[PDB]
Amino acid sequence: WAEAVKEPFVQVNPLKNGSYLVLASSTDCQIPPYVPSIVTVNETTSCFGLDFKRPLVAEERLSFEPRLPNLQLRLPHLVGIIAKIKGIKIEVTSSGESIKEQIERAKAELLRLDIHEGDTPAWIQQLAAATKDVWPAAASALQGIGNFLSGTAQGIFGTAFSLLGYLKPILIGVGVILLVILIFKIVSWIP
Amino acid sequence: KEQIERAKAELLRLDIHEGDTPAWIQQLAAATKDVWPAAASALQGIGNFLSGTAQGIFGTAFSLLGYLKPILIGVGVILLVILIFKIVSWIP
Amino acid sequence: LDFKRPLVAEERLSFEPRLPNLQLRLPHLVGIIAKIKGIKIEVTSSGESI
Amino acid sequence: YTCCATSSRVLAWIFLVCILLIIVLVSCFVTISRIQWNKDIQVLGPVIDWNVTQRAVY
Amino acid sequence: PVPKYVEVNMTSIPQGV
Amino acid sequence: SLRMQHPVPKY
Ligand SMILES: *[C@@H]1O[C@H](CO)[C@@H](O[C@@H]2O[C@H](CO)[C@@H](O[C@@H]3O[C@H](CO[C@H]4O[C@H](CO[C@H]5O[C@H](CO)[C@@H](O)[C@H](O)[C@@H]5O)[C@@H](O)[C@H](O[C@H]5O[C@H](CO)[C@@H](O)[C@H](O)[C@@H]5O[C@H]5O[C@H](CO)[C@@H](O)[C@H](O)[C@@H]5O)[C@@H]4O)[C@@H](O)[C@H](O[C@H]4O[C@H](CO)[C@@H](O)[C@H](O)[C@@H]4O)[C@@H]3O)[C@H](O)[C@H]2NC(C)=O)[C@H](O)[C@H]1NC(C)=O
Ligand SMILES: *[C@@H]1O[C@H](CO)[C@@H](O[C@@H]2O[C@H](CO)[C@@H](O[C@@H]3O[C@H](CO[C@H]4O[C@H](CO[C@H]5O[C@H](CO)[C@@H](O)[C@H](O)[C@@H]5O)[C@@H](O)[C@H](O[C@H]5O[C@H](CO)[C@@H](O)[C@H](O)[C@@H]5O[C@H]5O[C@H](CO)[C@@H](O)[C@H](O)[C@@H]5O)[C@@H]4O)[C@@H](O)[C@H](O[C@H]4O[C@H](CO)[C@@H](O)[C@H](O)[C@@H]4O)[C@@H]3O)[C@H](O)[C@H]2NC(C)=O)[C@H](O)[C@H]1NC(C)=O
Ligand SMILES: *[C@@H]1O[C@H](CO)[C@@H](O[C@@H]2O[C@H](CO)[C@@H](O[C@@H]3O[C@H](CO[C@H]4O[C@H](CO)[C@@H](O)[C@H](O[C@H]5O[C@H](CO)[C@@H](O)[C@H](O)[C@@H]5O)[C@@H]4O)[C@@H](O)[C@H](O[C@H]4O[C@H](CO)[C@@H](O)[C@H](O)[C@@H]4O)[C@@H]3O)[C@H](O)[C@H]2NC(C)=O)[C@H](O)[C@H]1NC(C)=O
Ligand SMILES: *[C@@H]1O[C@H](CO)[C@@H](O[C@@H]2O[C@H](CO)[C@@H](O[C@@H]3O[C@H](CO[C@H]4O[C@H](CO)[C@@H](O)[C@H](O[C@H]5O[C@H](CO)[C@@H](O)[C@H](O)[C@@H]5O)[C@@H]4O)[C@@H](O)[C@H](O[C@H]4O[C@H](CO)[C@@H](O)[C@H](O)[C@@H]4O)[C@@H]3O)[C@H](O)[C@H]2NC(C)=O)[C@H](O)[C@H]1NC(C)=O
Ligand SMILES: *[C@@H]1O[C@H](CO)[C@@H](O[C@@H]2O[C@H](CO)[C@@H](O[C@@H]3O[C@H](CO[C@H]4O[C@H](CO)[C@@H](O)[C@H](O)[C@@H]4O)[C@@H](O)[C@H](O)[C@@H]3O)[C@H](O)[C@H]2NC(C)=O)[C@H](O)[C@H]1NC(C)=O
Ligand SMILES: CCCCCCCCCCCCCCCCCCCC(=O)O[C@H](COC(=O)CCCCCCCCCCCCCC)COP(=O)(O)OCCN
Ligand SMILES: CCCCCCCCCCCCCCCCCCCC(=O)O[C@H](COC(=O)CCCCCCCCCCCCCC)COP(=O)(O)OCCN
Ligand SMILES: *[C@@H]1O[C@H](CO)[C@@H](O[C@@H]2O[C@H](CO)[C@@H](O)[C@H](O)[C@H]2NC(C)=O)[C@H](O)[C@H]1NC(C)=O
Ligand SMILES: *[C@@H]1O[C@H](CO)[C@@H](O[C@@H]2O[C@H](CO)[C@@H](O)[C@H](O)[C@H]2NC(C)=O)[C@H](O)[C@H]1NC(C)=O
Ligand SMILES: CC(C)CCC[C@@H](C)[C@H]1CC[C@H]2[C@@H]3CC=C4C[C@@H](O)CC[C@]4(C)[C@H]3CC[C@]12C
Ligand SMILES: CC(C)CCC[C@@H](C)[C@H]1CC[C@H]2[C@@H]3CC=C4C[C@@H](O)CC[C@]4(C)[C@H]3CC[C@]12C
């Protein structure tokens, strides 16, 4: 299962034996982001705006803690866009799924998020964020052509293109009327 | 009437696309099978032709010619504008 | 259904909470957004910009 | 007069070429942006394995 | 400005369980 | 396993 969340994300659970369980979108006290971890400190300090205390020395007894098997997991490239356009917690793969089945799963859905006359700049900015890891040269270009339609002047070019997009059916109609005149006017020159 | 007018707009907007025509055509068949079995068997055939025959080269070819549509029109328009002038510049 | 007149009560010291008031601006087409999801969906925050 | 007549002709040609180029620039952008999106969808995605040691930053 | 350090140990949680 | 050394201010 995948689900979209708000940035910044911070979760710190104090454990009973005196360690702390941390999952956080940003670094603090040398703890890496995005991967969770069990954290212990030798001297009281403030991390993620709260106090992580040094635990009381304990006596060792025979353990019964479980040790689960490790597991690599491959996710779809655009998992973030799939989770965002559902607005609920959604199933994205299985532990033991093939590359082919995994891909043919949100492909039709994703293809039909096509370019529109009404949010071309907002679309072009998604395409860049999607392309950045694949082709960084193209991303930087797309991002540029994004900010040109949005920012340059008062966004007048964005406006102009948006409007010329919505007019397409009228233009064809006129274009057709011109041909029907031109053909007649031409045929009415030949002897 | 009420039951039908409930997912109709939603369902209509699952339209054909340049990027998964074979995968779409295979859904249309599964949808048509109980209604018109003769048509289903046909659609299923034209499905496997774009996917299987050769290395799917025809699927590829059609997918590509689909995405090029705007360029082709643009060129087509430039040809007319030449042809008209070249024709008008023959008449005495 | 029947809305009955209540029995007279004796007044005692209250501990009822009094929450702050709050204006809330919704999107113009909130009804169409809620309809095409077919589930309970998040539409804004208390303190969001236009 | 001849200069004004010539100017009108030259203006119309540059005005025609101006448009026919804009038609070609927009047409090429729509083709390339839509293909790249298709390729973005089918790339291999990230891998996660819950290894902390791997993500250490010094 | 004097250098003072605190030790911080970290361990993994297979499968996130 | 991952041992680290977090620096703390001592002014
Ligand atoms: C509060 O509570 C929490 C718990 O909730 C405390 O956190 C826990 O603290 C424990 C310490 O008491 C930690 O245990 C220690 O884990 C160390 C790391 O283990 C991993 O790496 C090992 C080595 O891997 C490398 O080297 C080998 C070759 O040697 C290579 O093959 C590898 O590729 C690596 O290069 C590895 O052996 C371990 O593998 C075992 O676990 C994983 C799952 O985690 C399994 O997939 C494996 O199959 C394997 O488990 C099986 O096999 C082993 C034997 O091989 C059995 O023991 C198991 O029962 C099972 O059958 C890991 O990948 C260990 O190095 C460390 O070892 C010490 O102890 C042993 C004796 O037990 C000695 O021989 C060693 O010399 C060493 O002293 C120890 O086990 C827990 O990980 C940690 N738990 C969590 C969830 O984080 C916390 O401390 C508490 N806080 C306070 C304040 O009290
Ligand atoms: C069954 O149970 C239910 C409860 O579950 C019963 O319903 C409850 O019945 C109560 C009556 O016992 C009602 O209380 C009454 O509310 C009246 C209206 O209060 C609002 O308006 C006030 C006036 O607003 C105008 O005028 C002022 C200037 O005077 C202007 O500033 C305004 O702009 C308006 O023009 C206003 O003072 C109130 O404001 C307070 O509450 C709101 C939230 O509701 C807060 O946002 C405010 O900050 C403020 O709360 C704080 O400040 C006040 C003091 O200013 C403190 O008292 C608070 O603790 C808090 O710190 C409202 O906007 C009141 O007019 C009415 O006042 C009577 O009592 C006081 C003494 O307490 C006298 O001085 C008055 O003269 C007057 O007699 C009273 O409080 C509950 O509203 C009602 N609850 C609900 C949820 O509906 C029900 O009756 C029961 N049924 C049966 C059968 O038993
Ligand atoms: C669960 O585990 C499975 C199995 O590991 C994971 O799926 C596999 O992912 C790996 C890594 O991404 C893929 O490796 C690539 O393999 C190709 C060659 O594939 C061909 O030959 C295979 C021979 O065994 C065969 O299995 C393949 O068959 C599948 O694909 C065909 C075609 O779509 C399909 O019809 C079949 O039904 C199968 O689905 C196929 O014939 C190879 O070209 C790749 O090379 C790249 O990487 C290497 C190493 O970095 C590099 O050296 C090269 O230069 C190149 O960059 C790569 O090795 C593998 O194809 C996947 N296998 C399957 C069956 O899908 C899966 O991801 C895991 N799931 C989860 C959820 O984690
Ligand atoms: C939470 O609270 C906020 C703050 O009140 C609400 O957002 C505001 O809503 C009001 C009412 O709908 C908006 O009022 C209008 O303001 C414009 C002028 O806006 C410009 O100047 C502002 C100066 O302070 C500035 O803040 C604005 O900046 C925002 O917008 C720009 C451009 O998009 C953006 O880049 C910024 O990042 C900001 O987001 C902006 O520069 C004014 O023209 C309007 O006038 C109309 O109404 C009046 C009164 O009826 C009338 O007299 C006029 O004739 C005209 O009809 C109007 O006053 C305000 O813009 C909103 N502010 C922001 C920051 O968005 C929000 O709705 C509340 N949320 C919820 C969920 O309830
Ligand atoms: C973070 O992880 C560290 C491991 O890298 C922890 O360090 C270990 O902590 C134990 C606490 O019991 C130390 O044990 C002490 O050892 C000294 C004497 O040291 C010698 O003998 C020990 C075995 O007893 C041996 O491991 C050493 O190599 C030495 O030969 C005793 O005086 C104490 O009484 C106690 O037994 C380990 O020595 C120490 N190991 C290492 C490699 O440093 C550290 O505690 C962890 N920190 C936090 C914040 O949890
Ligand atoms: C006041 C300012 C000055 C005026 C400037 C304008 C002057 C014009 C002169 C006259 C010529 C008119 C030309 C007509 C253009 C009409 C535009 C059509 C847009 C259109 O229909 O496209 C749709 C939406 O895309 C869009 O609408 C996106 C359009 C492209 C946006 C990007 C523009 C920047 C290009 C950068 C070029 C460099 C890149 C590298 C080559 C999608 O197409 P579809 O409808 O077929 O449906 C396909 C499936 N959805
Ligand atoms: C190396 C191999 C050899 C090369 C072969 C090709 C040679 C071509 C020679 C030059 C001629 C070029 C012809 C131009 C074709 C362009 C294709 C346009 C496709 C297109 O835009 O259609 C869109 C997607 O459909 C599609 O893209 C689906 C297209 C149709 C797929 C099915 C093809 C099999 C037909 C079977 C015939 C027998 C059936 C019974 C009659 C949808 O259309 P829209 O964009 O208007 O939007 C409508 C609302 N979404
Ligand atoms: C977890 O990550 C660490 C670091 O990438 C792996 O440890 C390395 O293993 C390789 C051999 O595969 C050694 O050459 C390196 O010296 C090791 N580095 C360190 C810092 O110890 C580790 O194998 C990974 N996997 C597991 C299951 O622990
Ligand atoms: C916690 O661990 C730190 C490791 O940074 C200890 O720091 C050492 O302190 C001694 C003084 O006893 C210094 O001589 C060393 O140079 C420090 N080591 C470093 C910076 O690597 C610290 O003493 C420990 N604190 C407690 C309370 O045990
Ligand atoms: C301006 C007057 C003379 C009318 C002339 C008609 C011209 C401007 C119209 C007629 C048909 C139009 C084309 C119809 C369809 C498309 C596909 C779209 O994805 C890009 C633009 C493009 C290629 C249009 C460009 C403008 C166009 C060529
Ligand atoms: C190849 C060179 C000479 C360019 C000539 C232009 C030709 C190939 C182009 C110009 C406009 C194109 C048409 C534009 C729109 C559609 C609708 C689509 O749903 C099916 C294909 C169809 C009917 C196209 C077929 C190919 C077409 C006729």
Tell me, using a 6 A CB cutoff, whether residue A155 lines ligand 1: no
Task: Give how far Cα A140 sits from Cα of A130, A131, A137, D34, D41, Å.
Answer: 12, 9, 6, 17, 19
Indicate the residue type of A4: A
Rounded CA-CA distance A4/A59 in Å is 43
Tokens 């356009």 sit on residue: A85
Do C and E touch, 3+ Cβ pairs within 8 Å? The answer is: no
**Backbone dihedral angles phi then psi of residue E4, each to the nearest 5 degrees:** -130, 135
State in Å: Cα A30 to ligand 8 middle: 19
User: What technique was this entry resolved by?
Assistant: cryo-EM
Joined tokens for residue C48 = 């969001």
Longest Cα–Cα distance of chain C, Å, equals 52
Measured between CA atoms, the residue of chain A closest to residue B18 is A111
**Backbone dihedral angles phi then psi of residue B65, each to the nearest 5 degrees:** -60, -30
- DSSP code at position E15: G
Indicate the residue type of B80: L
Q: Which chain D residues are within 8 Å of F2, Cβ to Cβ?
A: 52-53, 56
Residue B92: partners with Cβ closer than 8 Å, 6 or more residues away: A191
Cβ–Cβ contact C50 with A under 8 A: no
Omega cis (within 30) before C6: no
State in Å: Cα B58 to ligand 7 middle: 10
D neighbours by CB contacts (3+ pairs under 8 Å): A, B, E, F
Task: Give how far Cα B39 sits from Cα of A131, B30, B43, F11, Å.
Answer: 41, 11, 6, 83
Residue from A13, A28, A41, A72 whose CB has the most chain E CBs within 10 Å, to mutate: A41
Count CB neighbours of B47 within 10 A. Answer: 20
Tokens 């930053």 sit on residue: D57
Coil, helix or strand for A121?
Answer: helix
Measured between CA atoms, the residue of chain A closest to residue F5 is A30
Measured between CA atoms, the residue of chain D closest to residue A114 is D34
Q: What is the 3-state secondary structure (H, E, C) of A147-175?
A: HHHHCCCCCHHHHHHHHHHHHHHHHHHHH
Inter-chain CB proximity F4 and D52 less than 8 Å: no
Strands F2-8 and E4-11: antiparallel
Tell me, using a 6 A CB cutoff, whether residue A154 lines ligand 5: no
Count CB neighbours of A110 within 10 A. Answer: 21
Q: What Rg, from alpha-carbon coordinates, does chain F have?
A: 10
Inter-chain CB proximity D27 and B73 less than 8 Å: yes
Q: What Rg, from alpha-carbon coordinates, does chain B have?
A: 21
